[PDB]
Design a protein around this ligand. Sequence first.
Ligand SMILES: CC(=O)SCCNC(=O)CCNC(=O)[C@H](O)C(C)(C)COP(=O)(O)OP(=O)(O)OC[C@H]1OC(n2cnc3c(N)ncnc32)[C@H](O)[C@@H]1OP(=O)(O)O
Ligand SMILES: CC(=O)SCCNC(=O)CCNC(=O)[C@H](O)C(C)(C)COP(=O)(O)OP(=O)(O)OC[C@H]1O[C@@H](n2cnc3c(N)ncnc32)[C@H](O)[C@@H]1OP(=O)(O)O
Ligand SMILES: CC(=O)SCCNC(=O)CCNC(=O)[C@H](O)C(C)(C)COP(=O)(O)OP(=O)(O)OC[C@H]1O[C@@H](n2cnc3c(N)ncnc32)[C@H](O)[C@@H]1OP(=O)(O)O
Lengths: 187, 186, 188
Amino acid sequence: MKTEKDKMLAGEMYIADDEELVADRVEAKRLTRLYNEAVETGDERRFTLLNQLLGSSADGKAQINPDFRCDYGYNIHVGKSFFANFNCVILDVCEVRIGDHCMFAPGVHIYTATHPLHPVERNSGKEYGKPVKIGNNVWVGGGAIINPGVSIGDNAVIASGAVVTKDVPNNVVVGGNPAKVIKTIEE
Amino acid sequence: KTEKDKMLAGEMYIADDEELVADRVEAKRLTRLYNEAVETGDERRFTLLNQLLGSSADGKAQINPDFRCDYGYNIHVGKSFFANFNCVILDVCEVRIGDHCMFAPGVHIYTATHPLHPVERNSGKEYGKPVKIGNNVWVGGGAIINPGVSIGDNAVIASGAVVTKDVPNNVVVGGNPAKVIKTIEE
Amino acid sequence: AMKTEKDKMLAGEMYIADDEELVADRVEAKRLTRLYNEAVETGDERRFTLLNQLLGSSADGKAQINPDFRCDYGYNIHVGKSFFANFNCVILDVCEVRIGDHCMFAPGVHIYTATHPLHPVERNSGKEYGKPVKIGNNVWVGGGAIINPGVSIGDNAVIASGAVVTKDVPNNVVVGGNPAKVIKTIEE
Ligand SMILES: CC(=O)SCCNC(=O)CCNC(=O)[C@H](O)C(C)(C)COP(=O)(O)OP(=O)(O)OC[C@H]1OC(n2cnc3c(N)ncnc32)[C@H](O)[C@@H]1OP(=O)(O)O
Ligand SMILES: CC(=O)SCCNC(=O)CCNC(=O)[C@H](O)C(C)(C)COP(=O)(O)OP(=O)(O)OC[C@H]1O[C@@H](n2cnc3c(N)ncnc32)[C@H](O)[C@@H]1OP(=O)(O)O
Ligand SMILES: CC(=O)SCCNC(=O)CCNC(=O)[C@H](O)C(C)(C)COP(=O)(O)OP(=O)(O)OC[C@H]1O[C@@H](n2cnc3c(N)ncnc32)[C@H](O)[C@@H]1OP(=O)(O)O
């Protein structure tokens, strides 16, 4: 009684080649291409296009540099004054919730998509995701990776190249691969 | 024997050889067309890919934009190949990938490399080492797979992993440099 | 003096990112980068003449940079002779990026001179800053390596693929890992 798209958003195994999901993706790719051309050439319509790609932004003025990639787009919800530098990728099979005043340096990747560890489940045509939640005033450094299901508290700083495999508390700098706490921000 | 011959054989070759240069230029030119085909959703994406890749077991490899490669023709994939956004494959030597393999976004595979010593490195000659990836390998996002590496069946490469040496069957590797994190029981 | 935000930025002082001159500079860099990338991708002979308008300087006007290259300003990037960068390198040149001769970047290398305050309020103040990056001669940066702001890399250094370079790197070493550590030295 659930559609594949229902299952996907729900964290449950779903069929990636479901006809609706497929059409959502070819649409996202098409719009993303227009968006990228718009931001690359500095056209004011980039916001109009972004605002049809992203599931939502708090101020309809998110700044995202080229070439952005996403799976669906509509699962991405960002707060006020969102900035993302060159070449960010967001696999938003599940919800990606980002707070206010967040900044991504170039090449930041956020994944909610994943697979089973075992070859048969994984090769079975089904797969699933775990939503990612990012707080307020989070600064993600260049090339960091935020794995599925991860949550990052407010005022956190992800160092460049960090592979964030576990939740990150408020007011910490984390770094490394896998990332660990390396400092506490004092207020 | 041609510079292309030495290249495939893992020997020092002259990167600026006339034939190799034209190969690389054709590859870039066709890659742009392919990437546009995928981005716009045109079903001629497959025909293009099949002209670019060395071979595909089912002619139905699913590779998202923007794919980049050196030659293309040294890449051979099994069936149901999938690579997500922004994968890069430097196929100066053979890159052989099994069946049901999945690359997440931003996976890089390098067969190309250079001499550690300045003079040799700058001498206009380079070399490669082939990469072999078995069946049912899942490579996580932003993993790097170095020249010469082999990855055995059912291995999963964690996201961000820098895979500097061989990966046996049925393990999960992670980290930088990568190391075994757990074995898999299937 | 008659000192602008751009002047503070170059000097490594806090600057207002959205200063109209700087904003317009970044917009120009993007338009030109898009042409450049198209020129190199399609194999056109004018790629060099375009690249020479983008970069601050090159020693020989013949730098080889594969698509899709990206940079903040372009004009803070100064390369020596025989520069090579493979696919998808990003350079944030808010401050100077000086690169010596015979350097080669593998795909996906990122050089950052841009950074931010660690505290949220200062970071959200519309102000930011940078620390310049200096890379010597005969440097090979392996694929996906990251050069952080303020880093110096000595002559003949080899950065392993995936290395995250957070501190100065001396002459004639191979470094690797996260954070990058010396693995071995290299002498000719
Ligand atoms: C094809 C497509 O486009 S979709 C795929 C796109 N998305 C991805 O790439 C997701 C990447 N997934 C990962 O990296 C996961 O960490 C996987 C593959 C290793 C799966 O691991 P999981 O067991 O489900 O998560 P979990 O965090 O619990 O793993 C356990 C441990 O390994 C860890 N671990 C996870 N990632 C790493 C890592 N990169 N390096 C070292 N250890 C790691 C944890 O540190 C953890 O430690 P512990 O059990 O000793 O306390
Ligand atoms: C939004 C935009 O477009 S601009 C942003 C683009 N550029 C970036 O991404 C820059 C990334 N910045 C960083 O990673 C920095 O190193 C930060 C955020 C950790 C700032 O920390 P700092 O205090 O200025 O450097 P500091 O050397 O003191 O940090 C301490 C240690 O952590 C380290 N450390 C710093 N950066 C990292 C890192 N990227 N990865 C792992 N460890 C790191 C250091 O190795 C250092 O070692 P030590 O205490 O053992 O001597
Ligand atoms: C410009 C272009 O387009 S071409 C380049 C495209 N592709 C590249 O980036 C290739 C990258 N090559 C590498 O990173 C190699 O690992 C290099 C440069 C470090 C050279 O390493 P080599 O000495 O030839 O191979 P080797 O695997 O024997 O290196 C030895 C050690 O360093 C290691 N080592 C290799 N890579 C790393 C790494 N990323 N981090 C830490 N240690 C590493 C090994 O663990 C090894 O340890 P040990 O001998 O103490 O047990």
